[PDB]
Amino acid sequence: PFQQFGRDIADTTDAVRDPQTLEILDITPCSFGGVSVITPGTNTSNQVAV
Amino acid sequence: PAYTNSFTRGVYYPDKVFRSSVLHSTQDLFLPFFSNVTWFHAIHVSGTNGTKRFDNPVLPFNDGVYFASTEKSNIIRGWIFGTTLDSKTQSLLIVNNATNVVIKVCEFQFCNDPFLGVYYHKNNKSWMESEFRVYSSANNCTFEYVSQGNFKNLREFVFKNIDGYFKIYSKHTPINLVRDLPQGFSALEPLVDLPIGINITRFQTLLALHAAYYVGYLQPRTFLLKYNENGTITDAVDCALDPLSETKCTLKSFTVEKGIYQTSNFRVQPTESIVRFPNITNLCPFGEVFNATRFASVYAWNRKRISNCVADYSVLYNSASFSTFKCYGVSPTKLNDLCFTNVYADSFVIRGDEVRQIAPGQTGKIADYNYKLPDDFTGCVIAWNSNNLDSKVGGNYNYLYRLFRKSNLKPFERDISTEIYQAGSTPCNGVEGFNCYFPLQSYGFQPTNGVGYQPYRVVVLSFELLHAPATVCGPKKSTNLVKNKCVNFNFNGLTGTGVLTESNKKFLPFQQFGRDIADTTDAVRDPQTLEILDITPCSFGGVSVITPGTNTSNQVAVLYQGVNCTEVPVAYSTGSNVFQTRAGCLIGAEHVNNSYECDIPIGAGICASYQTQTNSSQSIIAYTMSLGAENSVAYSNNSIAIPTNFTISVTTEILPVSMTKTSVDCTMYICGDSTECSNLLLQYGSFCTQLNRALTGIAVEQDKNTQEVFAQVKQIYKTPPIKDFGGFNFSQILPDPSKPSKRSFIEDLLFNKVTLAKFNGLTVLPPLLTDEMIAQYTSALLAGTITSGWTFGAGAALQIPFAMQMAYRFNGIGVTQNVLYENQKLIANQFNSAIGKIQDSLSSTASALGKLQDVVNQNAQALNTLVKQLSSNFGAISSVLNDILSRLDPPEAEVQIDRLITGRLQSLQTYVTQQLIRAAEIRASANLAATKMSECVLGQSKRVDFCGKGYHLMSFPQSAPHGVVFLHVTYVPAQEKNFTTAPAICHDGKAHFPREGVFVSNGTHWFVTQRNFYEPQIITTDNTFVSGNCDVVIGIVN
Ligand SMILES: *[C@@H]1O[C@H](CO)[C@@H](O[C@@H]2O[C@H](CO)[C@@H](O[C@@H]3O[C@H](CO[C@H]4O[C@H](CO)[C@@H](O)[C@H](O)[C@@H]4O)[C@@H](O)[C@H](O[C@H]4O[C@H](CO)[C@@H](O)[C@H](O)[C@@H]4O)[C@@H]3O)[C@H](O)[C@H]2NC(C)=O)[C@H](O)[C@H]1NC(C)=O
Ligand SMILES: *[C@@H]1O[C@H](CO)[C@@H](O[C@@H]2O[C@H](CO)[C@@H](O[C@@H]3O[C@H](CO[C@H]4O[C@H](CO)[C@@H](O)[C@H](O)[C@@H]4O)[C@@H](O)[C@H](O[C@H]4O[C@H](CO)[C@@H](O)[C@H](O)[C@@H]4O)[C@@H]3O)[C@H](O)[C@H]2NC(C)=O)[C@H](O)[C@H]1NC(C)=O
Ligand SMILES: *[C@@H]1O[C@H](CO)[C@@H](O[C@@H]2O[C@H](CO)[C@@H](O[C@@H]3O[C@H](CO[C@H]4O[C@H](CO)[C@@H](O)[C@H](O)[C@@H]4O)[C@@H](O)[C@H](O)[C@@H]3O)[C@H](O)[C@H]2NC(C)=O)[C@H](O)[C@H]1NC(C)=O
Ligand SMILES: *[C@@H]1O[C@H](CO)[C@@H](O[C@@H]2O[C@H](CO)[C@@H](O)[C@H](O)[C@H]2NC(C)=O)[C@H](O)[C@H]1NC(C)=O
Ligand SMILES: *[C@@H]1O[C@H](CO)[C@@H](O[C@@H]2O[C@H](CO)[C@@H](O)[C@H](O)[C@H]2NC(C)=O)[C@H](O)[C@H]1NC(C)=O
Ligand SMILES: *[C@@H]1O[C@H](CO)[C@@H](O[C@@H]2O[C@H](CO)[C@@H](O)[C@H](O)[C@H]2NC(C)=O)[C@H](O)[C@H]1NC(C)=O
Ligand SMILES: *[C@@H]1O[C@H](CO)[C@@H](O[C@@H]2O[C@H](CO)[C@@H](O)[C@H](O)[C@H]2NC(C)=O)[C@H](O)[C@H]1NC(C)=O
Ligand SMILES: *[C@@H]1O[C@H](CO[C@@H]2O[C@@H](C)[C@@H](O)[C@@H](O)[C@@H]2O)[C@@H](O)[C@H](O)[C@H]1NC(C)=O
Ligand SMILES: *[C@@H]1O[C@H](CO)[C@@H](O)[C@H](O)[C@H]1NC(C)=O
Ligand SMILES: *[C@@H]1O[C@H](CO)[C@@H](O)[C@H](O)[C@H]1NC(C)=O
Ligand SMILES: *[C@@H]1O[C@H](CO)[C@@H](O)[C@H](O)[C@H]1NC(C)=O
Ligand SMILES: *[C@@H]1O[C@H](CO)[C@@H](O)[C@H](O)[C@H]1NC(C)=O
Ligand SMILES: *[C@@H]1O[C@H](CO)[C@@H](O)[C@H](O)[C@H]1NC(C)=O
Ligand SMILES: *[C@@H]1O[C@H](CO)[C@@H](O)[C@H](O)[C@H]1NC(C)=O
Ligand SMILES: *[C@@H]1O[C@H](CO)[C@@H](O)[C@H](O)[C@H]1NC(C)=O
Ligand SMILES: *[C@@H]1O[C@H](CO)[C@@H](O)[C@H](O)[C@H]1NC(C)=O
């Protein structure tokens, strides 16, 4: 009951609480990064891959 | 009186924050632990006796107070929190019972202290007989709010104030124990925080006038805070309280282990600052000028330049001979030690009414034609009247003044010229009168005039702030002589902290300063006397605290790094125990004449430890550092020793093989979906483009090292499930068929030790080989070194029989397969025992993984940095700068974000510099690991003593988070067979030897053997061949 905000070991927001009703919650960042292109040599064809 | 101290209680939650399973050395306002507190007996009298003075429990709100009285009826109601209570501050009233409160903030002008009458036939909650006075003041109500007896509970409350807003903390802990101060801890949570807007300096309790009890204080300390798995305050430790307080603070652990730890440096404060100057005023024109025959007039005010000297004007003030020592622009005080460009001595005579005219902004005939002070108002008035020193009967009008001119005098214009004045039109030519009068008149003053119209002795000082050198400076305040004690000195410009001791040099007249080889302040010469001085910074050094692990008790210790004892706040396990040595002013450790083996060196050769000694025990002992003790094995010219035994000990020295392969979304890291920040960082461009380039180069370089050190052959190999060796087996390292992944137990113990460690751009690139597949490799590597062995080098898993695989390994340090073939069963049994000791140590001594767990520790710590310099906000007050950008006007926001982003680029270049230097060190380590796997696992190097401590017999890879263990199987000799020896034997009148062999007899027979084991044989021409001569050989036997 003494909790209004949250954080975690690495000082990152671990949980936030709806301040109008009390239910467990977590925050996991959406994409976790990552945009790269696995394409073969452009001397070869243009069939791309992501 | 009685002054029993309080327990570890007195704490509240730091602020409006929650954060679980995590420790914090958070800075806020706390009651010091174990500080002496009161035991206030102000309790009621009884019907027949029970009397006492019964004075009031009163301790002013010194930064905060802790309340720990365990009543049994709680008749105390008032909680008077007023800044002063003297009818001028809104004293908030608090009355408490079972968790509900009424609130009022009225003033207080009570009598004595608001008191009641406790008697018979009354007093539980109601009266039926009234009494119980409640009201004593009513002026304003600026804020308000409405909601066996053996120690059933405790009503304790901590009170603190920040920014005016006040936080009540209450927690009615059930403490049935009737013994004493409960040796435990439980914090206090805040119900209502409300902004009274006034200081709190005093709190006082309701009483009456006509058994545990505690009340303490608060100081701006800072605590280590521990929150349990369920997330609540359980135990806390200070920083500045004891040496172990700061030990825990700098290690952020309730379970600190033994060692020295940097805490701070004892910035020994200088006792006094030594102000000093030349010996005398050095010909100041002020002790000689005032007594003069006659002054000059105002139009002819004298000019005696002041320079190349000092003047002490304070002694003039205390001579009480000035009618004015007030300065305009500058102040007469702080005119002493501050000096100006050019100064002049001007002596002359003014009128009392013309004392006004000589002042900034003041006008007059004198101010118009006789003297003007330029509008850069930096001037003074110093004078005294002359009715007693320049009085003359019949009066003196020799003091004149100019009275005709067209405009004002120029700055500092002294005019004596008699240029022909003509305001009018006609040339006067002797016709003088209307519009032709002479431009000179006198003053015509008598001694009998008023003091204003009386003569004045006036000397004014012109303090011009010109571009020329300033050479009229301040007075003397020396006699601050200092010898061998740490002080500050001030030789008018060149300073130095520390001591001023006579030194062994000579000095030169033109010289005044000093220097040294490093071009820093070394010696100074007294301007008032000739003395060959020295200056040395006060103490510096350091404060590295020695202590055993906090699993052991709180016997604390301090150390001063190589500094003389000049600070001794010492006060039967302890006592007057000062001992200075080469380490410096060591404290809290009895000096020991003997020196056992060192554990934790502290500086210059001392190791303070925590062993036990017998005298009639447990204390901190130090000694001059050593290693074990001295050893003395006699080293003749014909004596050897050779081991009849040995050990196969798998020492575990490990190597960081990779890093948490973090990338940086440079723009997004700096600018998490923010428009102008992204724009500006793209405009800066090249910076984070090459930072990303460098970190990608990191990623690729360490995963290619990961490959070559593991996929040395890209062809994977899987260990056959047929684990059959008769004892040589690798149960807890070889993959277990029944396990989920094909790891083994030691991997499990490594993994569950990830207790040392993605929202803020900490983009964790997955390893090219994750747990399961990095294990796939490492298992393949183990399979290769157990089955294919060294021939794994060239892409072909050329299997070899293992029983001869470690035979060739032993030959890798020149050990013939004999000892293996005759001891392999035991060799394997103690191999398994060594592995079991490894697992037991890694499950029982975390320092066994020490350096790798540490390197992972600062990997995570560097990531946490990268996160937390966003807190290092440089002048902003939010983590991500986008809201600061939104907080200012888009041009003004552009301006502020300019230098926030420059600081952020500073942080970027910093972090990447540390990451690159880690990359370099870990890259050398990676090539090291490659060499270990290659020259040490894919074979066996004749390269001695690098595959872990001691020799190398075998080495095994196995996964680790961003690392990899190497089971350094070292050969270490055990026995000492110290019988005689020689270079060779002249058995044929000439030297003898095999490809290599020491000739080491038993006396009974001559024995020849290797040089790492005792496997002797007799001299025989088959092995120990014949070469050399017996002509000049030294130490040989006939
Ligand atoms: C700044 O300028 C002032 C100007 O007066 C100097 O004051 C004089 O300084 C001299 C020497 O500097 C003083 O001579 C003193 O001699 C004493 C020895 O006593 C014998 O000799 C005297 C000579 O008359 C006999 O009468 C006497 O009976 C003895 O036979 C010393 O003990 C004195 O030492 C004191 O002063 C020096 C600094 O001068 C300090 O370092 C010492 O610790 C000690 O305090 C001194 O040498 C003379 O008496 C002074 N007279 C006056 C009127 O001041 C200052 O000395 C000068 N500043 C410095 C640093 O020299
Ligand atoms: C180099 O150093 C290592 C350790 O640093 C040594 O390892 C030790 O090896 C010795 C070899 O003997 C071990 O000694 C033990 O002796 C026991 C004696 O038992 C005999 O005698 C009793 C009567 O006293 C009889 O009842 C018994 O039947 C035997 O006739 C042996 O029994 C021990 O054998 C072990 O295995 C058997 C298997 O069944 C068990 O039953 C036993 O209980 C026992 O566990 C063993 O031989 C000694 O224990 C080893 N050290 C350690 C720490 O274990 C190397 O030997 C040494 N090399 C040299 C050359 O000295
Ligand atoms: C964080 O702290 C919380 C509070 O301390 C922890 O809650 C614990 O949860 C357990 C599990 O239910 C409680 O266990 C017991 O409760 C019984 C009551 O018995 C009666 O009611 C139960 C239903 O609850 C019923 O099945 C029985 O037949 C009875 O009808 C008590 O009698 C037991 O003594 C015990 O209290 C705990 O009470 C509660 N903790 C306690 C003891 O404070 C929570 O789990 C914590 N989280 C952790 C550990 O991380
Ligand atoms: C604890 O104190 C509070 C406040 O003094 C009490 O709350 C009020 O008590 C009065 C009687 O003293 C009632 O008339 C009110 O209805 C109560 N509630 C309010 C004002 O909101 C409370 O009764 C006290 N409880 C105990 C056990 O002493
Ligand atoms: C509060 O205290 C009064 C006394 O001041 C209690 O009165 C007692 O009542 C019991 C009856 O249960 C008598 O046996 C005692 O002799 C009384 N005490 C006297 C007359 O001094 C009252 O019961 C108490 N009430 C509570 C709720 O504690
Ligand atoms: C290696 O050999 C030893 C001894 O022959 C085996 O030790 C067994 O370990 C298990 C572990 O749970 C015990 O339950 C057995 O009692 C031990 N002794 C046996 C089976 O005789 C070990 O299992 C072997 N490991 C491999 C991989 O073969
Ligand atoms: C080798 O050392 C031995 C002893 O350490 C030497 O033998 C004698 O040593 C003592 C003291 O060192 C001398 O007083 C004797 O004169 C030595 N005797 C001889 C015959 O030298 C020995 O000299 C050393 N050198 C060699 C080549 O053996
Ligand atoms: C395209 O490539 C043809 C064959 O080269 C092969 O494929 C490339 C991708 C490389 O892997 C190379 O080592 C292989 O041998 C060429 O015949 C052709 O000329 C190339 N066309 C270009 C380069 O424009
Ligand atoms: C507690 O008692 C000790 C012993 O007399 C005393 O030195 C100390 O000053 C006391 N603490 C106070 C008065 O805060
Ligand atoms: C009553 O108690 C007080 C305690 O302050 C004590 O001094 C006094 O002697 C007691 N009365 C009698 C008659 O003993
Ligand atoms: C204490 O009083 C000063 C008076 O100048 C005031 O400025 C300050 O804000 C007060 N502090 C608190 C916490 O009310
Ligand atoms: C603390 O832990 C070390 C670790 O081995 C141990 O040697 C020591 O005996 C322990 N002492 C106490 C008091 O727990
Ligand atoms: C500390 O004092 C001693 C003598 O008390 C002196 O020899 C030593 O040089 C001093 N330390 C330093 C750093 O000068
Ligand atoms: C030898 O023992 C004495 C007795 O305490 C001690 O004072 C002295 O410092 C010791 N000497 C050394 C070199 O430790
Ligand atoms: C081994 O060294 C000791 C000296 O500690 C010596 O007394 C002994 O004689 C030596 N052994 C042999 C066989 O010479
Ligand atoms: C030396 O000779 C005796 C008698 O043969 C033997 O018992 C002993 O083990 C031998 N020692 C060494 C070190 O060779």
Beta strands B487-491; B273-275: pairing state? parallel
Q: Give ∠ CA B760-B766-B767 in degrees, rounded to 5.
A: 135
Residue contact B864–A10, C-beta within 8 A: yes
User: Which among B281, B296, B284 has a CA at the least distance from the CA of B457?
Assistant: B296
Q: Give the separation between CA B632 and CA B758, rounded to whole angstroms.
A: 58
Paired tokens of B643: 């081991």
**A29:B758 CB<8 A:** yes
Nearest CA residue ID for atom 5, ligand 14: B593
- State the residue for tokens 């019907």: B47
Residues of A with CB under 8 A from a CB of B: 2-14, 27-29, 32-34
Q: How far apart are CA B219 and CA B236, in angstroms?
A: 16
CA atoms of B9 and B11, how far apart (whole Å): 6
Candidates B21, B22, B233: best to mutate against A (most CBs of A within 10 A) is B22
DSSP assignments along B229-275, one per residue: TT--EEEEEESSSSHHHHHHHHHT-TTPPSEEEEEE---PPPS-EEE
Nearest-atom number in ligand 5 for the CA of B123 is: 5
> Ligand 2: distance of its center to the CA of B652 in Å?
27
Between strands B343-348 and B304-306, the pairing is antiparallel
Closest residue CA from atom 8 of ligand 15: B978
How far is ligand 1, taken at its centre, from the CA of residue B274, in Å? 22
Tell me, using a 6 A CB cutoff, whether residue A43 lines ligand 8: yes
Q: Residue A12 is nearest to which of B17, B18, B760, comparing CB atoms?
A: B760
Tell me which DSSP letter residue B780 carries: H
Give Dmax (Cα) for chain B.
Answer: 150
With contact defined as beta carbons under 8 Å apart, do B956 and B967 qualify? yes
Phi-psi region of B111 (alpha: psi -120 to 50; beta: other; left: phi over 0): beta
Structure tokens given for B987: 């058995």
Distance CA B138, CA B699 (A): 73
Half-sphere exposure of B298 (CA within 13 A, CB side): 29
Record the tokens describing residue B89, joined without a space: 């501050």
In three-state secondary structure terms, B660 is: coil
Mutate to test the interface with B, among A4, A7, A36 (most CBs of B within 10 A): A7
Angle ∠(B235,B238,B240) on CA atoms, nearest 5: 165
CA distances (Å), B544 to each of B426, B580, B624, in order? Answer: 96, 15, 17
Residues linked to residue B459 through DSSP beta bridges, in sequence order: B347
Q: Taking CA B399 as the corner, what is the angle to CA B396 and CA B403, rounded to the nearest 5 degrees? A: 130
**Roughly how many angstroms between the first and final C-alpha of chain A, as a whole number?**
47
Burial class (CB in 10 A: 0-12, 13-18, 19+), B1029: exposed
Ligand nearest to the CA of B217: 9
Nearest to B19 among A6, A27, A34 (CB): A6
The Cα B815–Cα B822 span in angstroms is 13
Cα B401 to Cα B404: distance, rounded to the nearest angstrom: 10
- Pocket residue to mutate for ligand 3, from B18, B228, B230, B233, most atoms within 8 A of Cβ: B230
Q: What share of chain A is helix, strand, coil (3-state, %, to 5)?
A: 0, 0, 100
Q: Hunting for tokens 């605290």 — which residue is that?
A: B545
Taking CA–CA distances from A29, the nearest residue in chain B reads: B759
Find the B837 Cα to ligand 6 centroid distance in Å.
16
From A27, which residue of chain B is nearest by alpha-carbon distance? B759
Among residues B86, B70, B51, the alpha carbon closest in space to that of B204 is found at B86
Q: For residues B711 and B334, what is the distance between their CA atoms, to the nearest angstrom? A: 78
**What burial class does residue B48 get, using C-beta atoms within 10 Å of its C-beta: 0-12 exposed, 13-18 middle, 19+ buried?**
exposed
Amino acid type, B448 = T
Q: Strand, helix or coil at B336?
A: coil
Are B675 and B1016 in contact by the 8 Å Cβ rule? The answer is: no
One-letter amino acid at B1024 equals T
Ligand 8 atom at minimum distance from A41 CA? 9
As separate numbers, helices (DSSP H) first and strands (DSSP E) second, chain A gives 0, 0
Cα B963 to middle of ligand 2, angstroms? 38
End-to-end CA distance of chain B: 93
Query: How far apart (Å, rounded) are the C-alpha atoms in residues B964 and B849?
Result: 11
DSSP H or E stretch at residue B614: none
Q: Which residues of A touch B664 (CB under 8 A)?
A: none
CA distance B703 to B521: 53
* B944 half-sphere exposure, CB direction, 13 A CA radius: 8
Q: State the DSSP string of B409-437.
A: PPTT-----------SSS--TT--BTTB-
Q: How far is the C-alpha of B205 from the C-alpha of B78, rounded, in Å?
A: 6
* Residue closest by Cα to atom 11 of ligand 14: B593
Decide whether any atom of ligand 4 lies within 6 Å of the B551 Cβ.
no
Whole-angstrom distance, CA of residue B244 vs CA of residue B911? 31
Rounded to an integer, what distance in angstroms lies between the CA atom of residue B841 and that of residue B845? Answer: 5
Q: Residue B752 phi/psi, 5° resolution?
A: -75, -5
Give residues with Cβ within 8 angstroms of B363, minimum separation 6.
B357
The three-state secondary structure class of B396 is strand
> Distance from the CA of B59 to the center of ligand 11, in angstroms?
20
